[PDB]
Design an enzyme around this catalytic site. Structure first.
Site, PDB file in Angstrom:
ATOM      1  N   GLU A  60     -29.433 -44.735  22.048  1.00  0.00           N
ATOM      2  CA  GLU A  60     -29.246 -43.774  23.461  1.00  0.00           C
ATOM      3  C   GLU A  60     -30.387 -42.676  23.515  1.00  0.00           C
ATOM      4  O   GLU A  60     -30.917 -42.560  24.582  1.00  0.00           O
ATOM      5  CB  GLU A  60     -28.031 -43.237  23.097  1.00  0.00           C
ATOM      6  CG  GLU A  60     -27.452 -42.545  24.760  1.00  0.00           C
ATOM      7  CD  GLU A  60     -26.600 -41.510  24.551  1.00  0.00           C
ATOM      8  OE1 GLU A  60     -27.196 -40.286  24.380  1.00  0.00           O
ATOM      9  OE2 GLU A  60     -25.432 -41.596  24.737  1.00  0.00           O
ATOM     10  N   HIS A  61     -31.035 -42.341  22.445  1.00  0.00           N
ATOM     11  CA  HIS A  61     -31.967 -41.476  22.254  1.00  0.00           C
ATOM     12  C   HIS A  61     -33.224 -41.982  22.752  1.00  0.00           C
ATOM     13  O   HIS A  61     -34.130 -41.202  23.118  1.00  0.00           O
ATOM     14  CB  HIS A  61     -31.973 -40.774  20.983  1.00  0.00           C
ATOM     15  CG  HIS A  61     -31.120 -39.579  20.905  1.00  0.00           C
ATOM     16  ND1 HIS A  61     -31.613 -38.175  20.781  1.00  0.00           N
ATOM     17  CD2 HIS A  61     -29.702 -39.403  20.703  1.00  0.00           C
ATOM     18  CE1 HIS A  61     -30.207 -37.433  20.451  1.00  0.00           C
ATOM     19  NE2 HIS A  61     -29.309 -38.202  20.399  1.00  0.00           N
ATOM     20  N   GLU A 137     -28.267 -32.254  16.768  1.00  0.00           N
ATOM     21  CA  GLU A 137     -27.221 -32.183  17.692  1.00  0.00           C
ATOM     22  C   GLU A 137     -26.035 -32.435  16.793  1.00  0.00           C
ATOM     23  O   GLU A 137     -24.945 -32.247  17.535  1.00  0.00           O
ATOM     24  CB  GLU A 137     -27.406 -33.559  18.533  1.00  0.00           C
ATOM     25  CG  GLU A 137     -28.673 -33.449  19.422  1.00  0.00           C
ATOM     26  CD  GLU A 137     -28.834 -34.400  20.561  1.00  0.00           C
ATOM     27  OE1 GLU A 137     -27.998 -35.637  20.172  1.00  0.00           O
ATOM     28  OE2 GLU A 137     -29.553 -34.580  21.402  1.00  0.00           O
TER      29      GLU A 137
END
Lengths: 444, 101, 420, 220
Positions: A60-61, A137
């Site tokens: 996703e990153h 994160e």
């Protein structure tokens, strides 16, 4: 003017057409100059394993740091410069990458999308940078009690299974995942039969599918490639996990029983049920006059800072429960009242209560289709989960058939005398004993 | 009619709380409605009620009453709480009614 | 099903906007020209408390019936507000509009502000305010308007501490009587037929004509309020007097906004199209954020940048944000940058209306500070009709004008307005 | 001191220089009375320019000498007095630090009159910077200052403070006659100059109360 009944009927239909590679294209055309199109994928952490857990998140990153056709700088500059918004996410059983732009660019968008899911660059230098970012994160999300709690709830409610893992993965998995693993993940999961290209706003279904046939090429050869994999079932476990830290200001507690899973009609009744109980938070102005009994009690007795009911669905299972935030010395009363309300659901619901719960639910479903992104999110999901779109007109039909007698039966069937799963975090000394909680599971 | 309008003045003097300097409303049994009503009274009214009552209790422990001059006169008795108490009860009856519906 | 946007304007100056989009849900609202802007040192926070007072008993409905009644039909009722406008709106399914309407009407035109209800409500300003201030974002903006003005707009949006528990039913009443006047109110309403929304505004909206209390002019101060509080992250905002609502120079700034950069468009992505972002990026090495700040008010506005950064790098980060504004005032603006922006602005505008809430806000904002509905094509025509010069001028106005700054965190390495 | 004190040697950490900002911090808090103080960079300690200000202090007025009495010898007080009608107070503020100092006035007044009261305090400073200082005023002050000094040492506490203050930021004891010689040796000009330095220098202001009618530093 026109009634709620009619306005529901006049809603433009959702068009769905499957390609040859197995990809499905759906859309709801409105008279809007702006639109949203994206691809919803039937992938997520549940599809991961013990060694690649966190790959889909790591992917996703990178999904946005450029493809092979056009590198990072190039990619970003092209999207930014057209005023388009690129966003996406990844859950346990569903992933999505969608864009918000003018309907005028609908086709250029579609090209960008397909370029993203099909040609992620997976730049080796980039992976080492997102590695550090993801690790940051994790520490940030670690301070979000609400998510720490729901993770723990899954960790135990589905202990020993795929659904027991977080979406972000583990520190180890993230420290060691490789360009290969990511490549592999993508090549293994992002595939036409498991994807859906949905769009909403001012777009021509036909112009969409045309632009689609053009950029979603990859046509499978073997029968394996176009068969959608059935996941091994996840065993639910009545149990608890208590993460105590008296140094935290407020305690979080989530309690849930196993849910039926997307396909089951009961989910409609369960949602009506959650509507009767509802939610609260110290900023609700209704205060002591709120219709939710639990809400009123929370107010009258300063029981908590907030609480919410939920009915998280999954393909083969789910989680029906509630979560609340309270001060160390009111956890017990809150829990007591909460479980009390669940018992009321199974034994003494009123036509009045459901009558109101239904209206709240209607407004809720309607509110989930307020914009293009949310309508597009619905389509991507409905297809991926129900294998079709369920119009508000239908939902309403189902919701209207629900009555007291029905709420009680459904609730009894899922809640009454069940071993729940409990997660508690914070200064939780006053909340105690699984046994005591388990007893709050019967006799109104 | 102005018939019992006299009976009242009679009962009022028969009762005798005015000999303690108490208003009719000062003698009310503090159930739930009356308690809420009292919370709504303005500071000044509230403090006056308080003194009147504390005064009465002191007279009662002493086994005395006020000099005939200080007795509250039927027509000068302030129904300071009846307005609030009336509202409190309606509100309540509204809810009770609504919660049945 | 798709056409029009009627808009009457009754005898007393009460504007009525309306649009039927056949949505299964309606959303009616009462826009008003009121806010902490019209507060005086004497009644500060009264506007804030009024905001929280929306659920208190009215002359037609009781505190109890309001909440129960609305919830009964799955409706909602909320009050949003800026320093100079207050909106009271309600949503619900089409078939309940008439029911939800009563309470809306009652709340805005018939409050009672019973002393006891009001007394119990006040300790709530303490809470409400505490959750809002969890976002450092909100703290500096308060102090900004306080450093950027000497009055009206200088007033806080959240009741000051010393005044909690001291607001009175008088003040609330006077505030309403002197501001909630037909010529300062608009009865907008998506999801309904215009004749209907009009028949309502008439026979029921009592508090008639007037313009009551008029806000003092927005005097510009240009001060610098700094807040040392330890936070590892320093939030700083440096602005200058900018364009006002309906100002020709407005569209200019808005565009200079996007050129400099106003918020990311790609998740976790870098902003290359953002000159300001990119500028700071090359300056610092650690995480941070920087954006173009731009507010347009009735008789004034503010323009500048906002920057979040690690304490030890606030210096380099803010300077960089400056150099990038000067570099832009000296013609550092391509004719393309102006083109890109114009698109981002049009798109941003267009997307910011897909929301029932966003649309109603748009419609009513005009029908209140105008009485007309600028067509989308017109607003588009006005936006691109902005030269590359206008933009470099806006920039100039900033590098030249008197600046006011608001910062908070571990300011140990944050520069003073006179070191920029 | 010797055979006992041990943490020793050096001067360790050295304070950063006192950079002057010239800001204006205002505190809205409701109080019926508004306290305001407007100052400018003054003189440091051990500075020749010190005595000049100290004297300009007394000339403008620094605290009452007669209980409940009015201060006629106080130009500043008297000035404001003629300006407002309600109760208030005004004095000459003066602080001398190692590498800097502050000089100005301080004024307590009813909210609605802070405007007139602070202005008055100002006009009275400008009027003084423009030669509004009699050669007598300078004489009266010099006495009030010498007396004030002399009285402020009868206290065991006051004396020890005096003695030690020198022995620390000096290492010597300026005889009383010397400090006297230094005080009166201040021309009527020095005083009008000090005043000038204020009307000219960058001012910083601090105020708190119901500032609804209090002026901003740029309105003075």
């Amino acid at each position: 003017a026109a009634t709620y009944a009619q306005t529901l009927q006049n809603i433009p239909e959702t068009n769905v057409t499957t390609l040859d590679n197995g990809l499905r294209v759906a859309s709801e055309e409105s008279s809007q100059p702006t639109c949203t199109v994206g691809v919803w994928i039937g992938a997520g952490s549940r599809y991961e394993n013990e060694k690649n857990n966190g790959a889909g998140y790591f992917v996703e990153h990178l999904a946005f740091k450029g493809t092979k056709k056009r590198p990072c700088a190039a990619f970003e500059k092209e999207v930014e410069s057209m005023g388009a918004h690129f966003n996406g996410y990844t859950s346990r059983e569903q992933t999505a990458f969608y864009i918000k732009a003018l309907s005028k660019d609908m086709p250029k968008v579609v090209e960008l999308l397909a370029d993203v899911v099909q040609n992620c660059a997976l730049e080796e230098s980039q992976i080492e940078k997102e590695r550090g970012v993801i690790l940051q994160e994790l520490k940030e999300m670690d301070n979000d009690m609400t998510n720490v709690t729901f993770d723990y709830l899954h960790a135990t409610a589905f202990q020993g299974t795929a659904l027991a893992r977080t979406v972000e993965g583990t520190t180890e998995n993230i420290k060691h995942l490789t360009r290969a693993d990511l490549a592999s993940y993508i090549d293994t999961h992002f595939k036409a039969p498991r994807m859906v290209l949905a769009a909403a706003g001012g777009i021509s279904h036909k112009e969409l599918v045309d632009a689609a046939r053009q950029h979603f090429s990859g046509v499978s050869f073997t029968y394996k490639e176009d068969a959608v994999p059935i996941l091994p079932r996840c065993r639910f476990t009545g149990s608890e996990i208590r993460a105590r830290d008296d140094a935290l200001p407020v305690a979080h507690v989530a309690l849930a029983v196993e849910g039926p899973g997307w396909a089951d009609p009961d989910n409609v009744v369960l949602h009506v049920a959650n509507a009767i109980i509802g939610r609260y938070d110290r900023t609700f102005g209704g205060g002591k006059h709120l219709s939710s009994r639990l809400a009123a009690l929370a107010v009258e007795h300063k029981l908590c800072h907030s609480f919410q009911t939920f009915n998280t669905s999954y393909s083969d299972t789910g989680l029906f429960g509630f979560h609340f935030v309270a001060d160390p010395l009111s956890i017990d009363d809150m829990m007591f009242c909460a479980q009390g309300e669940w018992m009321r659901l199974c034994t003494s619901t009123t036509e009045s209560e459901v009558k109101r719960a239904k209206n709240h639910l209607r407004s809720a479903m309607v509110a989930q289709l307020d914009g293009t992104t949310p309508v597009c999110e619905t389509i991507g999901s409905h297809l991926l989960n129900y294998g079709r779109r369920i119009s508000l007109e239908e939902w309403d039909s189902r919701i209207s058939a629900v009555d007291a007698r029905m709420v009680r039966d459904v609730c009894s069937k899922y809640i009454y005398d069940k071993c729940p799963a409990l997660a508690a975090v914070g200064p939780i000394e006053q909340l105690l004993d699984y046994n005591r909680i388990r007893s709050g599971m019967y006799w109104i | 009619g102005r018939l019992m309008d006299r009976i009242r003045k009679w009962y009022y003097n028969a009762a005798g709380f005015n000999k303690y300097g108490l208003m009719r409303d000062d003698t009310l049994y503090e159930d739930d409605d009356v308690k809420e009503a009292l919370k709504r009274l303005p500071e000044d009214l509230y403090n006056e009620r308080m003194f009147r009552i504390k005064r009465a209790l002191d007279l009662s422990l002493k086994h005395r009453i006020l000099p005939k001059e200080q007795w509250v006169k039927y027509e000068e008795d302030k129904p300071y709480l009846e307005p609030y108490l009336k509202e409190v009860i309606r509100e309540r009856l509204e809810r009770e009614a609504w919660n049945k519906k | 099903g798709a056409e029009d946007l009627e808009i009457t304007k009754l005898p007393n100056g009460l504007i009525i906007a309306s649009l039927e989009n056949f949505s299964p849900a309606s959303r009616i609202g009462v826009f008003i020209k009121a806010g902490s802007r019209y507060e005086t040192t004497a009644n500060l926070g009264t506007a804030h408390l009024l905001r929280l007072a929306s659920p208190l008993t009215t002359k037609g409905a009781s505190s109890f019936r309001i909440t129960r009644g609305i919830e009964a039909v799955g409706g909602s009722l909320s009050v949003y507000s800026t320093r100079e406008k207050m909106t009271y709106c309600v949503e619900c399914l089409r078939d309940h509009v008439d029911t939800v309407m009563e309470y809306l009407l009652n709340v805005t035109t018939a409050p009672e502000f019973r002393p006891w209800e009001v007394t119990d409500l006040q300790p709530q300003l303490k809470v409400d305010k505490a959750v809002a201030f969890q976002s450092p974002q909100v703290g500096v903006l308060e102090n900004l308007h306080a450093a950027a003005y000497k009055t009206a707009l200088a007033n806080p949006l959240y009741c000051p501490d010393y005044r909690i528990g001291k607001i009175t039913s008088e003040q609330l009443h006077h505030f309403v009587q002197n501001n909630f006047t037909s010529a300062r109110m608009a009865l907008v309403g998506i999801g309904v037929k215009h004749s209907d929304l009009k028949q309502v505004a008439e026979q029921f909206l009592n508090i008639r004509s007037g313009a009551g209390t008029s806000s003092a002019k927005a005097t510009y101060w240009g001060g610098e309020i700094r807040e040392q509080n330890g936070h590892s992250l320093v939030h700083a905002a440096v602005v200058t007097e900018g364009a006002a609502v309906g100002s020709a120079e407005a569209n200019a700034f808005s565009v200079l906004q996007h050129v400099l950069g106003a918020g990311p468009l790609i998740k976790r992505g870098s902003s290359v199209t953002s000159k300001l972002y990119q500028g700071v990026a090359k300056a610092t090495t650690q995480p941070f954020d920087a954006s173009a700040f731009n507010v347009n008010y009735s008789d004034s506005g503010l323009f500048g940048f906002y920057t979040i950064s690690q304490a030890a790098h606030a210096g380099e980060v803010i300077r960089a944000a400056m150099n990038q504004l000067k570099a832009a005032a000296q013609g550092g603006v391509t004719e393309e940058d102006v083109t890109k922006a114009k698109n981002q602005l049009k798109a941003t505008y267009l997307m910011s209306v897909e929301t029932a809430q966003g649309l109603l806000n748009e419609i009513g904002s005009e029908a209140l500070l105008s009485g007309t509905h600028t067509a989308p094509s017109v607003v588009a025509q006005k936006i691109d009709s902005v030269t590359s010069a206008d933009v470099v001028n806006a920039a100039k106005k900033f590098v030249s004008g008197k600046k006011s700054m608001a910062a908070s965190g571990d300011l140990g390495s944050t520069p003073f307005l006179d070191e920029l």
